[PDB]
Scaffold this active site. Structure first.
Site, short mmCIF file in Angstrom:
data_model
loop_
_atom_site.label_atom_id
_atom_site.label_comp_id
_atom_site.label_asym_id
_atom_site.label_seq_id
_atom_site.Cartn_x
_atom_site.Cartn_y
_atom_site.Cartn_z
N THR A 290 0.80 -1.24 0.00
CA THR A 290 0.00 0.00 0.00
C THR A 290 0.83 1.29 0.00
N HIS B 37 -7.77 -9.68 2.97
CA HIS B 37 -6.93 -10.34 3.95
C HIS B 37 -7.69 -11.34 4.82
N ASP C 260 -4.48 0.48 -5.77
CA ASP C 260 -3.04 0.42 -5.53
C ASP C 260 -2.37 -0.97 -5.82
N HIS C 261 -3.17 -2.05 -5.82
CA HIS C 261 -2.70 -3.44 -5.97
C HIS C 261 -3.86 -4.44 -5.91
N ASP D 238 21.79 1.77 -10.15
CA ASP D 238 20.83 2.87 -10.04
C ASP D 238 19.90 2.91 -11.25
N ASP E 202 26.49 3.64 -16.62
CA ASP E 202 27.72 3.99 -15.93
C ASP E 202 28.68 4.70 -16.86
C1 LIG Z 1 13.51 7.99 -11.76
O1 LIG Z 1 13.36 9.39 -11.65
C2 LIG Z 1 14.18 10.11 -10.76
C3 LIG Z 1 13.77 11.59 -10.75
O2 LIG Z 1 13.95 12.19 -12.02
C4 LIG Z 1 15.67 9.89 -11.08
O3 LIG Z 1 16.41 10.28 -9.95
C5 LIG Z 1 17.09 11.53 -10.10
O4 LIG Z 1 18.37 11.25 -10.60
C6 LIG Z 1 19.38 12.24 -10.55
C7 LIG Z 1 20.70 11.59 -10.97
O5 LIG Z 1 20.99 10.47 -10.17
C8 LIG Z 1 19.54 12.92 -9.18
O6 LIG Z 1 20.34 14.08 -9.39
C9 LIG Z 1 21.35 14.33 -8.39
O7 LIG Z 1 20.80 15.25 -7.46
C10 LIG Z 1 21.65 15.89 -6.52
C11 LIG Z 1 20.78 16.83 -5.67
O8 LIG Z 1 19.48 16.28 -5.61
C12 LIG Z 1 18.78 16.60 -4.39
O9 LIG Z 1 17.60 17.36 -4.64
C13 LIG Z 1 16.61 16.63 -5.35
C14 LIG Z 1 15.57 17.56 -6.01
O10 LIG Z 1 15.04 18.57 -5.17
C15 LIG Z 1 16.06 15.55 -4.40
O11 LIG Z 1 15.03 14.78 -4.99
C16 LIG Z 1 17.15 14.59 -3.91
O12 LIG Z 1 16.59 13.84 -2.83
C17 LIG Z 1 17.06 12.47 -2.68
O13 LIG Z 1 17.79 12.25 -1.48
C18 LIG Z 1 17.05 12.38 -0.25
C19 LIG Z 1 17.99 12.06 0.91
O14 LIG Z 1 19.11 12.91 0.84
C20 LIG Z 1 15.79 11.49 -0.20
O15 LIG Z 1 14.96 11.82 0.90
C21 LIG Z 1 15.01 11.54 -1.53
O16 LIG Z 1 14.05 10.50 -1.54
C22 LIG Z 1 15.95 11.40 -2.73
O17 LIG Z 1 16.55 10.12 -2.59
C23 LIG Z 1 16.76 9.34 -3.79
O18 LIG Z 1 17.56 9.99 -4.77
C24 LIG Z 1 18.96 10.16 -4.50
C25 LIG Z 1 19.63 10.86 -5.68
O19 LIG Z 1 20.35 11.99 -5.22
C26 LIG Z 1 19.61 8.81 -4.18
O20 LIG Z 1 20.95 9.02 -3.79
C27 LIG Z 1 18.83 8.06 -3.08
O21 LIG Z 1 19.35 6.76 -2.89
C28 LIG Z 1 17.33 7.98 -3.36
O22 LIG Z 1 17.10 6.98 -4.33
C29 LIG Z 1 18.47 15.33 -3.56
O23 LIG Z 1 18.51 15.65 -2.18
C30 LIG Z 1 22.74 16.64 -7.28
O24 LIG Z 1 23.55 17.37 -6.39
C31 LIG Z 1 23.57 15.63 -8.09
O25 LIG Z 1 24.56 16.31 -8.82
C32 LIG Z 1 22.67 14.81 -9.04
O26 LIG Z 1 22.46 15.55 -10.23
C33 LIG Z 1 18.17 13.26 -8.59
O27 LIG Z 1 18.29 13.53 -7.22
C34 LIG Z 1 17.21 12.09 -8.68
N1 LIG Z 1 15.91 12.46 -8.13
C35 LIG Z 1 15.23 11.67 -7.29
C36 LIG Z 1 13.90 12.19 -6.81
O28 LIG Z 1 15.60 10.56 -6.90
C37 LIG Z 1 15.97 8.41 -11.32
O29 LIG Z 1 17.28 8.30 -11.84
C38 LIG Z 1 14.94 7.71 -12.22
N2 LIG Z 1 15.17 6.28 -12.29
C39 LIG Z 1 15.49 5.69 -13.45
C40 LIG Z 1 15.73 4.21 -13.41
O30 LIG Z 1 15.61 6.29 -14.52
O1 LIG Z 2 -4.04 -0.13 7.53
C1 LIG Z 2 -3.74 0.12 6.41
C2 LIG Z 2 -3.46 -1.02 5.47
C3 LIG Z 2 -4.11 -1.14 4.26
C4 LIG Z 2 -3.81 -2.22 3.48
C5 LIG Z 2 -2.86 -3.20 3.92
N1 LIG Z 2 -2.39 -4.33 3.35
N2 LIG Z 2 -1.45 -4.90 4.21
N3 LIG Z 2 -1.35 -4.11 5.30
C6 LIG Z 2 -2.22 -3.05 5.11
C7 LIG Z 2 -2.51 -1.98 5.90
N4 LIG Z 2 -3.66 1.54 5.96
C8 LIG Z 2 -3.92 2.80 6.87
C9 LIG Z 2 -3.21 4.02 6.11
C10 LIG Z 2 -3.75 5.56 5.85
C11 LIG Z 2 -3.93 5.61 4.29
S1 LIG Z 2 -4.02 7.21 3.61
O2 LIG Z 2 -5.36 7.81 3.83
O3 LIG Z 2 -2.93 7.96 4.24
C12 LIG Z 2 -3.74 7.10 1.92
C13 LIG Z 2 -4.36 8.27 1.22
C14 LIG Z 2 -3.48 8.51 0.01
C15 LIG Z 2 -4.02 8.50 -1.22
C16 LIG Z 2 -3.12 8.70 -2.35
CL1 LIG Z 2 -3.80 8.69 -3.90
C17 LIG Z 2 -1.78 8.90 -2.21
C18 LIG Z 2 -1.26 8.90 -0.99
CL2 LIG Z 2 0.45 9.13 -0.77
C19 LIG Z 2 -2.13 8.70 0.17
C20 LIG Z 2 -2.64 4.72 3.71
C21 LIG Z 2 -2.69 3.49 4.72
C22 LIG Z 2 -3.29 2.04 4.51
CA LIG Z 3 24.59 3.36 -12.94
ZN LIG Z 4 -3.02 -1.36 -0.39
ZN LIG Z 5 -3.56 -5.15 2.38
#
Ligand SMILES: *[C@@H]1O[C@H](CO)[C@@H](O[C@@H]2O[C@H](CO)[C@@H](O[C@@H]3O[C@H](CO[C@H]4O[C@H](CO)[C@@H](O)[C@H](O[C@H]5O[C@H](CO)[C@@H](O)[C@H](O)[C@@H]5O[C@H]5O[C@H](CO)[C@@H](O)[C@H](O)[C@@H]5O)[C@@H]4O)[C@@H](O)[C@H](O)[C@@H]3O)[C@H](O)[C@H]2NC(C)=O)[C@H](O)[C@H]1NC(C)=O
Ligand SMILES: O=C(c1ccc2[nH]nnc2c1)N1C[C@H]2C[C@H](S(=O)(=O)CCc3cc(Cl)cc(Cl)c3)C[C@H]2C1
Ligand SMILES: [Ca+2]
Ligand SMILES: [Zn+2]
Ligand SMILES: [Zn+2]
Length: 808
Positions: A159, A265, A308-309, A687, A691
């Protein structure tokens, strides 16, 4: 602490959240224990139910009721959703024949059609057909709107990861929510359903729909709801919000149902108890649609019905225990269920070795209902590795089973008959998409698609600019009546060289031999035309792929194939060739078994050499264009060029050989010729993206020849099989795979048997979108067809699942 002394008088479900320690009055106030004293009193009235009755018509306004039938309620915007029906002689929405909505029909003040997302938990795809007789409202939506036979969630099919993907169009690996339960090792904290940790904003990455909306001037209803708030009040709140004045009325709304997942479930996916949950959902839908008709918004709003699933048959006695495989069962933490995830119980431990853990779990019982992988070796279509929250050791569980640690965990931690979370290609997990409204199309079925795509579409419906995401914007244009997004091919970055003959045999010292000396104006002029590309339009059907990064490469023409050869990586980036139905498999002649010939178009300095391969007893070699499918004994020599050769573990060669020798011909027969593009992939940091030269972690011993982590092929043909691949008028058809390049075949438990019993099964598991291969290679395919670009985006997103017909 919160001083809850303040009041909710006239603030019922306010939209701007006020900050502590003043009391809140929004649909999340409950979950933070921060509501005002009178919230339950004022905001959650229940008196007299949720339906008008005859005696209630025209009545005297009583602020205590849950909803009203008093004359002034349409004005106040808070009637019971059936007020028009019983009191004003009006029919329900479900009873009106559906009229095409050719233009929006919105009341004065609506600067754009609002979007309502009606999300239903655990709504299995096959419900739409099977439960249709008891869901008439939903069946109206489906049949007048735009529907897909099913929509594909992300993995894990749980979910939280799935709802957050709907809102961001991001893979969990990118958004942060990789499970319903997670351990972050940089936080040293755990995300669980119960408790208050999951509330800290730090788990949640990406930019969700409502933030995208706000940041760009579009106000949003709040998405999350609280469990105790009944569904009827949820609907009435959305309609109240829609009655707000123009400057305060949100443009995007969300509804959510815990059902039918909550019962699934309990009773299983098809338990007879399931008919009621479904009846309910449908009634709730009816109440939104009646309510929108009352507000003159039912031919103005766009509604998305989405799950969702799905749900599978699962029970306690189908649990596999690790305690029957492991001895030190206590030096591991397991994250159990329909997917397993494993880590050391303590990082204080240096005795902890995953290699032995994996081995202990590999093919160890003939019956085995799971399979261990290191996360970097999971199929690439799952995109489930690039996050510190994903443990190195993953267990893919069989549909209908569970994995647990010890048995004690299952009787002291049977009660359930359904579950979900398996591989995203498993039928029983598929879910629903229906789109209904002015912007969606009328009576239209669209092909199945992945839910990561909806974010772009929801931004389109709102006039928003989508944040960087994982969808392929334009790949779902065929869903929409009119779309604000006209997609455009990316521009080629690197252009190729076209080298002619520039080197002599003697300049090469590569350590390769070939028996090729035995040697005519007519048939010499001829093969010259082959090396300039006179049969290029036979083997390059969709134009040459584009290279979307800066690099130096050469194009190379031959009789039977054509390649883009990377001077940097010393091997081709792609190799393209057509095999017609009529073509025939020949075998490598006895004399030419070890034949490797220099390529006089490419310098010794930018070539591989046989010497390094000899020295590396781990590594052997393979060919991209298979010699088995040469069109003539003469053309065969072309396949043995140093520039068609790639590195391959003996164990992989088994896989590759049978792909090349048997399956290509087979596909060619079944599909009426195929066009094949093949190449290496390098993703050492897993990723999902190419590379760079300086991220290579493995070379063939004593060389600058990089070792691919994977091998891809894209196999295309005419969607109409009565046309040969090389003369196709209309739409195309495609399937592809990304094969992990691994030194053993531990993934396949039948691997010591004949390839005919296990190879195609592996390939299937590693099926792939052309789009995934584009990320991994930095190339861009299909640049020259007769097809519209949107159609080509749809096609690059297709995934051939090898699952049979949905429903039975
Ligand atoms: C699916 O789509 C996404 C989005 O387009 C692609 O991911 C993007 O890829 C690029 C290149 O790897 C990244 O660019 C780098 O970004 C940094 C700075 O980026 C910061 O700010 C952004 C935007 O505001 C933010 O989203 C980033 O946040 C990440 O890290 C947080 C923790 O510090 C975390 O809470 C958040 O979820 C997010 O985490 C994920 O992404 C990072 C990548 O940085 C990764 O390390 C981590 O494991 C998570 O997976 C970030 O603070 C620059 O300084 C670099 O130079 C570089 O350019 C983008 O950040 C990245 N965006 C996102 C949202 O992930 C995927 O590549 C694509 N997948 C495929 C298969 O194509
Ligand atoms: O108990 C369960 C739950 C449901 C099934 C399961 N299977 N196995 N285990 C399971 C557990 N839950 C309570 C939670 C609050 C909701 S919620 O009201 O926060 C989602 C509203 C929302 C809509 C969109 Cl479109 C996008 C986002 Cl991000 C959030 C999500 C959760 C499910
Ligand atoms: Ca790679
Ligand atoms: Zn669900
Ligand atoms: Zn469920």
């Amino acid at each position: 602490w919160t001083a809850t002394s303040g009041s909710c008088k006239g603030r019922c479900f306010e939209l701007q959240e006020v900050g502590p320690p003043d009391c809140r009055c929004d649909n999340l106030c409950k979950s933070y224990s921060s509501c005002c004293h009178d919230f339950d009193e004022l905001c959650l009235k229940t008196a007299r139910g949720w339906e008008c009755t005859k005696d209630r018509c025209g009545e005297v306004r009583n602020e205590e009721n849950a909803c009203h039938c008093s004359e002034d309620c349409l004005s106040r915007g808070d009637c019971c959703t059936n007020y028009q029906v019983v009191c004003k002689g009006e029919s329900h929405w479900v009873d009106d024949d559906c009229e095409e909505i050719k233009v929006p029909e919105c009341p004065a003040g609506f600067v754009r059609p609002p979007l309502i997302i009606f999300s239903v938990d655990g709504f299995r795809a096959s419900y739409m057909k099977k439960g249709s007789k008891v869901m008439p409202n939903i069946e109206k939506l489906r049949s007048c709107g735009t529907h897909a036979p099913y929509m594909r969630p992300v993995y894990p099919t749980k979910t939280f990861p799935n709802l957050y993907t709907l809102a961001t169009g991001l893979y969990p690996e990118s958004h942060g929510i990789v499970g319903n339960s997670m351990y972050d090792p940089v936080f040293d904290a755990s995300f669980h359903l119960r408790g208050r940790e999951k509330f800290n904003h730090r788990w949640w990455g990406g930019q969700p729909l409502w933030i995208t909306a706000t940041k760009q001037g579009v106000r949003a209803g709040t998405f999350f709801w609280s469990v105790s708030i009944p569904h009827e009040r949820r609907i009435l709140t959305i309609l109240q919000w829609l009655s707000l004045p123009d400057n305060e009325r949100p443009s995007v709304y969300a509804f959510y149902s815990e059902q039918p997942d909550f019962s699934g479930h309990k009773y299983g996916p098809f338990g007879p108890e399931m008919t009621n949950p479904l009846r309910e959902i449908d009634k709730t839908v009816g109440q939104l649609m009646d309510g929108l008709k009352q507000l003159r918004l039912h031919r103005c709003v766009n509604v998305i019905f989405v799950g969702d699933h799905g749900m599978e048959d699962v029970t306690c006695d189908r649990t596999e225990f690790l305690s029957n495989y492991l001895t030190n069962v206590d030096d591991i933490t397991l994250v159990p269920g329909t997917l397993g995830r494993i880590r050391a119980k303590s990082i204080n431990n240096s005795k902890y070795d995953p290699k032995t853990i994996i081995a202990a779990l590999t093919c160890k019982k003939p019956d085995q209902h799971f399979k261990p992988y290191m996360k970097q070796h999971l199929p690439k279509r799952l995109h489930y590795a690039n996050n510190r929250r994903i443990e190195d050791i993953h267990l893919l569980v069989d549909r209908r089973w569970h994995v647990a640690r010890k048995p004690l965990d299952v009787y002291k931690k049977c009660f359930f008959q359904g579950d979900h979370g398996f591989d995203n290609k498993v039928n029983s997990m598929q879910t629903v998409f229906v789109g209904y409204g002015p912007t969606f199309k009328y009576r239209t079925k669209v092909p199945p698609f992945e839910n990561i795509e909806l974010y772009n579409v929801m931004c389109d419906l709102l006039g928003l600019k989508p944040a960087p995401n994982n969808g392929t914007h334009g790949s779902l244009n065929h869903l929409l009546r009119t779309n604000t997004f006209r997609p455009t091919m990316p521009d080629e970055v690197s252009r190729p060289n076209y080298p002619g003959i520039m080197y002599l045999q003697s300049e090469f010292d590569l350590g390769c031999t070939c028996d090729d000396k035995v040697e005519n104006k007519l048939e010499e002029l001829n093969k010259r035309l082959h090396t300039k590309g006179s049969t290029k339009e036979r083997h390059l059907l969709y134009g040459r792929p584009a290279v979307l990064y800066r690099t130096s490469y050469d194009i190379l023409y031959h009789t039977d194939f054509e390649s883009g050869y990377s001077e940097i990586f010393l091997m081709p980036l792609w190799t393209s060739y057509t095999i017609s139905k009529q073509a025939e498999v020949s075998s490598i002649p006895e004399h030419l078994t070890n034949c490797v010939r220099p390529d006089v178009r490419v310098s010794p300095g930018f070539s591989q050499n046989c010497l390094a391969y000899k020295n590396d007893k781990q590594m052997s070699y393979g060919f991209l264009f298979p010699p088995y499918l040469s069109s003539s004994p003469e053309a065969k020599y072309d396949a043995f060029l140093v520039t068609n050769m790639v590195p391959m573990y003996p164990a992989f060669k088994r896989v590759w050989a049978y792909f090349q020798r048997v399956l290509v011909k087979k596909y060619a027969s079944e599909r009426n010729g195929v066009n094949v593009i093949s190449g290496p992939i390098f993703d050492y940091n897993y990723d999902g993206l190419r590379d760079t030269e300086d991220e290579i972690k493995q070379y063939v011993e004593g060389s600058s020849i990089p070792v691919p982590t994977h091998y891809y092929s894209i196999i295309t043909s005419c969607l109409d099989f009565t046309q040969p691949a090389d003369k196709c008028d209309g739409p195309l058809s495609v399937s592809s795979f990304i094969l992990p390049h691994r030194p053993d075949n531990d993934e396949s438990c039948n691997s010591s048997e004949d390839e005919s019993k296990w190879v195609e099964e592996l390939m299937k598991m590693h099926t792939a979108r052309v789009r995934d291969i584009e990320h991994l290679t930095g190339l861009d395919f299909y640049r020259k067809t007769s097809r519209s670009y949107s159609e080509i985006l749809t096609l690059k997103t297709y995934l051939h699942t090898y699952e049979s017909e949905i429903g039975g």
